[PDB]
Ligand binder design. Structure first.
Ligand code: MG
Lengths: 401, 398
């Protein structure tokens, strides 16, 4: 079958769907990855077929989606979140991008559209051709969680009092292509999850789950990784968060290194300068392939994003999470902490001493390792990518007459 | 499981094994590709994890393997073929390359080694750690074909006259790593085939067969390709052949184009300029991904190589083949021809006129498309890459 996969130009959201693209490819299907022209090189570097759509995105040059306090989750708040993000997401998948993707769907006529959850050209293109479409998550389903609340609230207001910014947005987006607003434009014929069911939000809709494979991008094994591990290793990838905060970057690095293990730390040229002389047991590296590193690590310290935490899940590695707030990191961090698999320090509570002490516990108390391994066992038992391709074929077949 | 794949530094031979590497990957196995340092970038640019081994290879800078006449296939001929190719293959996977891949295997403990069929460091590394290994073909098994004859012809020699250049070479190759010679060093614990059984040589050993996925590196669909075609499209990939060959490139281009169809031709910039003004119905291009062009094509003209022909099989496209005779192109073109799915023009016989006339046949006689489509049917029945991953698990378990 022909699968049209679409993702806005962002390498992380691309890598999120690379293993699924390739599972579909090696089972025999023809897979096109459609994205803005600036994502073409990344699609190439992943071994896949790029179909450029729209103009370069260049996405790099009050109302949040991670809000979970019940009192803040009013109809008016979620309404306004929807109004704002409807604009942002439009920007991220253009009328040009959307027209190019519809034109390709009409020409190629795919049997399944799989769209990155932030890429709303996906469902417009799919519906121009009655292909069933799968909304692919890239962490927890914040948008579906808010959408469920919103639709529950809406169905109990007066009828004249149910403005829906998503309906106005997506009816508008679909209009030039004869695509009518349905609710399935918002959340997909169905949704594919990348996070394990035990940490996901309850949904009023079903979600396929999957033993998510964390694609780390092109990789060359360095010599130093090739050598028999000397003694316990810890992986430190908190570079970005650390520059943010009289208490110095060197101070943070000296404390974090003061533990019974070798540290592999990812740092800029900028940061390696800013921190000056490194401790003895620290190797600074601008990038490391986690799947080559993590099998030998007693801990990983990181900002709680999906790619890195899926690697700690897959390799059974305890975590020290300093959550960022780009998507779901705070909420997932607490889920791991509750299972005994992680220790958390919020950004506002960050001291060198606090990180070191947490790291020392992860290293010393084997309960964290056991909990991380238990997590790994339950992940290994999720449906394989081959099983998932089998579900996706049932979606495209069940989606046909 | 851990799978150590290895291939000498040639992109085509890497590409041969990329979709398998990725089948293995998405099934959850840990996959390393070991190749000389000058091939590490192509490995990482196909999305996989490279392990550099050995020194840069730089491969670009009467005794043939493809000899099939039985009057020529004497023990002495085959003996001398094995004496000459063992030197060539030793060169392509060094005592340094072999020592680095052995040391990596010792440390990483792969469960299974898969080695490109020209990459003889593989079985040494595999035997050094006692892991089983699969020899992965990149076309027909010329070497297996010759070895079958040789081993039999050797059997009937006086014991004192049974000199085996392959046993000598691989014995020497393994000895620093404590690997004694055994015939599994020559042909693998088992062999994985990429060509369909219908075009294959008879082998004394079974090979796993496979519904081969052709990969050719970066692939971007150009915009000119999103229109429905408005009549037969032809794909012309003979730039290299016409280059090494009164008649001007423009003579060829002009005749090949003299048909009722649109030609898409891959030509260097140097070639486009010195072929001069192009006919209306020809579009010169650097490269085009074949797997996206061929669905709309009535014919492909090519040199009969493994990746392009696997594409022709997969999309059921009739072929005009002008064989290279590098590895197996001559034998394979004849097989395609005998099935009614291709017409063949040997290089000594190549003239703008012949290309032209064969090209019209392919477009206008429905028997060729029908035969191309039967081939595709049969390809569709071969074991999926998923099945193949299951067979390779069994191999690793035994
Ligand atoms: Mg014959």
């Amino acid at each position: 079958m022909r699968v049209l996969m679409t993702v806005f130009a962002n390498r992380s959201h691309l890598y999120n769907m690379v293993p699924l693209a390739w599972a579909l490819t090696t089972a025999g299907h023809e897979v096109h990855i459609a994205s803005h022209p600036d994502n073409v090189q990344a699609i190439s570097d992943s071994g896949l077929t790029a179909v450029p759509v729209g103009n370069d995105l260049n996405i790099m040059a009050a109302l949040t989606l991670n809000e979970t306090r019940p009192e803040k989750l009013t109809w008016q708040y979620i309404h306004d979140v929807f109004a704002q993000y409807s604009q942002i997401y439009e920007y991220m998948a253009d009328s040009t991008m959307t027209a190019d993707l519809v034109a390709h769907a009409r020409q190629w006529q795919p049997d399944l559209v799989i769209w990155d959850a932030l890429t709303y050209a996906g469902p417009i293109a799919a519906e121009a051709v009655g292909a069933p479409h799968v909304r692919m998550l890239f962490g927890l389903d914040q948008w579906g969680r808010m959408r469920d609340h919103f639709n529950r609230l809406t169905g109990e207001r007066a009828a004249d009092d149910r403005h829906d910014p998503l309906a106005d947005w997506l009816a508008t987006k679909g209009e030039p292509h004869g695509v009518a607003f349905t609710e399935s434009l918002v959340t997909g014929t169905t949704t594919l999850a990348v996070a394990p069911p035990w940490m996901s939000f309850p949904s009023e809709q079903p979600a396929l789950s999957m033993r998510h494979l964390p694609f780390n991008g092109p990789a060359v094994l360095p010599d130093w990784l090739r050598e028999a591990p000397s003694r316990p290793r810890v992986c430190l990838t908190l570079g970005l968060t650390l520059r943010e905060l009289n208490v110095t970057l060197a101070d943070f690095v000296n404390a974090v290194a003061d533990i019974d293990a070798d540290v592999v730390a990812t740092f800029s040229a900028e940061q390696v300068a800013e921190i000056g002389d490194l401790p003895d047991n620290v190797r600074a590296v601008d990038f490391v392939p986690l799947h080559a590193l993590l099998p030998s690590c007693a801990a990983i310290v990181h900002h709680g994003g999906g790619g890195t935490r899926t690697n700690a899940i897959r390799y059974g590695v305890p975590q020290l999470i300093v959550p960022n707030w780009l998507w779901d990191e705070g909420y997932v961090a607490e889920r791991f902490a509750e299972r005994g698999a992680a220790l958390v320090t919020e950004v506002p509570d960050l001291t060198p001493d606090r990180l070191r002490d947490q790291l020392r516990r992860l290293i010393a108390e084997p309960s964290f390792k056991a909990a991380a391994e238990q997590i790994q066992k339950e992940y290994d038992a999720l449906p394989s990518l081959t099983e998932t391709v089998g579900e996706l074929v049932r979606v495209a077949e069940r989606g046909r007459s």
